[PDB]
Structures are given as C-alpha cells and as structure tokens.
Design a protein around this ligand. Structure first.
Ligand SMILES: *[C@@H]1O[C@H](CO)[C@@H](O[C@@H]2O[C@H](CO)[C@@H](O[C@@H]3O[C@H](CO[C@H]4O[C@H](CO)[C@@H](O)[C@H](O)[C@@H]4O)[C@@H](O)[C@H](O)[C@@H]3O)[C@H](O)[C@H]2NC(C)=O)[C@H](O)[C@H]1NC(C)=O
Ligand SMILES: *[C@@H]1O[C@H](CO)[C@@H](O[C@@H]2O[C@H](CO)[C@@H](O[C@@H]3O[C@H](CO)[C@@H](O)[C@H](O)[C@@H]3O)[C@H](O)[C@H]2NC(C)=O)[C@H](O)[C@H]1NC(C)=O
Ligand SMILES: *[C@@H]1O[C@H](CO)[C@@H](O[C@@H]2O[C@H](CO)[C@@H](O)[C@H](O)[C@H]2NC(C)=O)[C@H](O)[C@H]1NC(C)=O
Ligand SMILES: *[C@@H]1O[C@H](CO)[C@@H](O[C@@H]2O[C@H](CO)[C@@H](O)[C@H](O)[C@H]2NC(C)=O)[C@H](O)[C@H]1NC(C)=O
Ligand SMILES: *[C@@H]1O[C@H](CO)[C@@H](O)[C@H](O)[C@H]1NC(C)=O
Lengths: 51, 51
C-alpha cells in the first residue's frame, strides 16, 4: 500500500498537510495515513523537534 | 536537557474504600480502584506525572 506521512500545527491532523523545515515556534503533530479499500487508517505518531 | 517541546499528562491512581461489612480489623468491605476512572491509562505524551 501507499503510506502517507504529514504534519499539522494543532492536533486536528484533518485540518492541514504540511512539512516544517528548520526552526519552528510551535509544536507540530505528525501522523500516518494509509488506506485499504477506503479503510482510511490514520494515526498520530509523534511531535517534531524544535528544528 | 536537550531541546524539546513540553507536553504533560496527569494520572492518579485512586482508591475509595468502605469498612464494616461484618467487622473492622478483619478487612475492608470493598475498595474501588481506578486510573483516572479507567482500568487502563497510558502516556502518549512527552512528559507525565502520577499521584
Ligand atoms: C488521513 O485520514 C483521515 C481519516 O478520516 C482524514 O480525515 C478526513 O479529512 C477530510 C479532510 O482532511 C475531512 O473533511 C471533512 O469535510 C467535511 C465537508 O465540508 C468541507 O468541504 C466543503 C467543500 O469542500 C467546504 O465548504 C467546508 O468548509 C469543508 O471544508 C467537513 O464538514 C468535515 O468538517 C471535514 O473537514 C474528514 O472528516 C476527515 N476525517 C476525520 C476523522 O475528520 C485525513 O485527511 C487524512 N489525512 C490526509 C493528509 O489525507
Ligand atoms: C488527579 O486527582 C484530582 C482528584 O481526583 C483531580 O484533579 C483536581 O482538579 C481540581 C479542579 O480542576 C483541582 O483544583 C481544586 O479546585 C477546587 C475548586 O476551585 C479547590 O477547592 C481545590 O483547592 C483545588 O484547587 C485539584 O487541585 C486537582 N487535584 C490535584 C491533586 O491536582 C485531577 O483531575 C487528577 N488527574 C486526572 C487526570 O484527572
Ligand atoms: C496552523 O497553520 C494554518 C495554515 O492554514 C493556520 O491557518 C492560517 O492562520 C493565519 C494565522 O493563524 C490566518 O491568517 C490564515 O488565514 C489561516 N489559514 C486559513 C485557512 O484561514 C492555523 O492558524 C495554524 N495554527 C493552528 C493552531 O491551527
Ligand atoms: C464502588 O463502585 C460501586 C460502583 O460504582 C459503588 O456501589 C454503587 O453505589 C450507588 C450509590 O449507593 C448505587 O446506586 C449503585 O448500584 C452501586 N453499584 C453497585 C454495582 O452495587 C460502591 O459503593 C463503590 N464502592 C466503594 C468502596 O467506593
Ligand atoms: C475512562 O476515563 C474517562 C475518564 O474521564 C471516562 O469518561 C470513561 O468513561 C472511562 N472509560 C470507561 C470505559 O468507562
């Protein structure tokens, strides 16, 4: 399957799809998505480092 | 410590008890034990503490 990795500033991952490079000023939450016959499996993985 | 965003969760291990079921000294009648009201609590955060 395809696996999709992406992040958002709030925990509501459904509201954005970003990659921060370099230094932040806020936490970013990162998630994994993968879909099996519309079974859109989605999970939180972790918080990014400050940079 | 090395740079990291702060992120914390509280847990309490709680007990509530009743006595005098048939006697005292012998035993507690009943003790209700919980983790934040649950039977299972996990840390999914960078930091945590427990009471
Ligand atoms: C990873 O899998 C997740 C598991 O479901 C994905 O979550 C879903 O993401 C879509 C977008 O991320 C949500 O979209 C919903 O759209 C409805 C419809 O209204 C919207 O569109 C009209 C037309 O464009 C516009 O007028 C409205 O303003 C809206 O913008 C909303 O009403 C919902 O409120 C919501 O936004 C899904 O519900 C959502 N899943 C969950 C659990 O909420 C997530 O997209 C996947 N991640 C990635 C990067 O693909
Ligand atoms: C850990 O247990 C305590 C008790 O089960 C639950 O948190 C307690 O929440 C209150 C309200 O947020 C805290 O403040 C208290 O407010 C009252 C009313 O204004 C005031 O009289 C008390 O002096 C006090 O401020 C209480 O401090 C807090 N207790 C503790 C020990 O932190 C706490 O919710 C528990 N953890 C979880 C995950 O629920
Ligand atoms: C997360 O990043 C988004 C990117 O869309 C922020 O949304 C924008 O915030 C600025 C600053 O808050 C506004 O001027 C833009 O118009 C906003 N985007 C949209 C689509 O309106 C969002 O604030 C960020 N932070 C959080 C916690 O969600
Ligand atoms: C442990 O929990 C039970 C379950 O929450 C408590 O017993 C309940 O008490 C209320 C108030 O008297 C009744 O309406 C419920 O029917 C009782 N539940 C049951 C299953 O009998 C019990 O008192 C708690 N025990 C302790 C030591 O706190
Ligand atoms: C687990 O704890 C939350 C604590 O706020 C409570 O709402 C929930 O109903 C408890 N879980 C179960 C299965 O009762």
């Amino acid at each position: 399957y395809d696996v999709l990795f992406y992040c958002s500033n709030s925990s509501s991952g459904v509201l954005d799809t970003t990659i921060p490079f370099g230094p932040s000023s806020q936490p970013y939450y990162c998630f994994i998505n993968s879909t099996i016959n519309t079974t859109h499996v989605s999970t939180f993985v972790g918080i990014l480092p400050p940079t | 410590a090395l740079p990291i965003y702060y992120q914390h969760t509280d847990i309490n291990f709680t007990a509530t008890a009743s006595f005098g079921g048939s006697c005292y000294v012998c035993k507690p009648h009943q003790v209700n034990i919980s983790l934040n009201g649950n039977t299972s609590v996990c840390v999914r955060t960078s930091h945590f503490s427990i009471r």
